[PDB]
């Protein structure tokens, strides 16, 4: 009785996720004029957060954790690619031993 | 018995749900104090911090899953140790 | 039995190594090889 | 054969400790020959 891989091989189905982002709707009927019934009493001065650059460095903190673990996942992909080379040689080695 | 000696079965029968991803739409008032305003300076220039924290939680998930992918592949090299002994033991049991 | 005694001695020596090297990989990882293959 | 049965079993007695050795290969203690 012959072997067949046809029941070892499933269908790897590709689901496609068609994202369409939401259109930019906001109050375009505002500012027909700016009101003067209370006018723009406009408090200036500046030099303000800039907490966005510290938060780009909390992004870059958790990017240091992702760089150091993409470096470790690269050793763990070396192991899973050395498995793939160990199997490449050993499925030849079982076939050479089951033939020589 | 040339067929059963390669137990050809799809162990691919698991089905993980991606459900539970509920993105909360922030709905700030987006109008300054009262009518067109009587103050301007105090409106909290910040929120590119909250979008840089949205990229902190991008890079945190690129971290966290790969703190969990060194992981699954340390577990895989310990399973592949079992495959290395299963192969060396298969050459042994042919020999 | 003595090829399997060399395999058994390697299993103990590989434990003494594993509980220290893969057993400092421990603080990422952990230990044990055992004994036997005698036939 | 019985050597490979116990060496598979005692590679399983390595593999509880190798499951411990990266949080990893489970297949433990079991193929025991006598």
């Amino acid at each position: 009785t012959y072997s067949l891989g046809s029941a070892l091989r499933p269908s790897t189905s590709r689901s496609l996720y068609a994202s369409s982002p939401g259109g930019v709707y906001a109050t375009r009927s505002s500012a027909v004029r700016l009101r003067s019934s209370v006018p723009g009493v406009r408090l200036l001065q500046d030099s303000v957060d800039f907490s966005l650059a510290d938060a780009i460095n909390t992004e870059f903190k958790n990017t240091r954790t992702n760089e150091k673990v993409e470096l470790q996942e690269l050793n763990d992909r070396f192991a899973n690619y050395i498995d793939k080379v160990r199997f490449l040689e050993q499925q030849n080695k079982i076939l050479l031993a089951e033939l020589e | 018995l040339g067929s059963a000696l390669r137990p050809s079965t799809s162990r691919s029968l698991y089905a993980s749900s991606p459900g539970g991803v509920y993105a909360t739409r922030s709905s700030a008032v987006r109008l300054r104090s009262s009518v067109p305003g009587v103050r301007l300076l105090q409106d909290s220039v910040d929120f590119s911090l909250a979008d840089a924290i949205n990229t902190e939680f991008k890079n945190t998930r690129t971290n966290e899953k790969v703190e969990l992918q060194e992981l699954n592949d340390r577990f895989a090299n310990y399973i592949d140790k079992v495959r290395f002994l299963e192969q060396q033991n298969k050459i042994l049991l042919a020999e | 039995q003595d090829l399997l005694n060399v395999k058994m001695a390697l299993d103990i020596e590989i434990a003494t190594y594993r509980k220290l090297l893969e057993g400092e990989e421990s603080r990422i990882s952990l230990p044990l090889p055992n004994f036997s293959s005698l036939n | 054969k019985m050597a490979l049965d116990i060496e598979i079993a005692t590679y399983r007695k390595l593999l509880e400790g190798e499951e411990s050795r990266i949080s990893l290969p489970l297949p433990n203690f079991s193929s025991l020959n006598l």
């Binding site: 050793n75 070396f78 192991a79 050395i82 | 340390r74 090299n77 310990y78 140790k81 002994l85 060396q88 033991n89 050459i91 042994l92 020999e95 | 039995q1 003595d2 090829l3 399997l4 005694n5 060399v6 395999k7 058994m8 001695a9 390697l10 299993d11 020596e13 590989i14 190594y17 594993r18 090297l21 893969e22 990989e25 990882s29 090889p33 293959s37 036939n39 | 050597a3 490979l4 060496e7 005692t10 590679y11 390595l14 190798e18 050795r21 990266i22």
Partner: peptide, 15 residues
């Protein structure tokens, strides 16, 4: 020889 192949079971995780 088959006993040497049975004892090689033995060693640690690579890289």
């Amino acid at each position: 020889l088959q006993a040497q192949i049975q004892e090689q079971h033995v060693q640690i995780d690579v890289d």
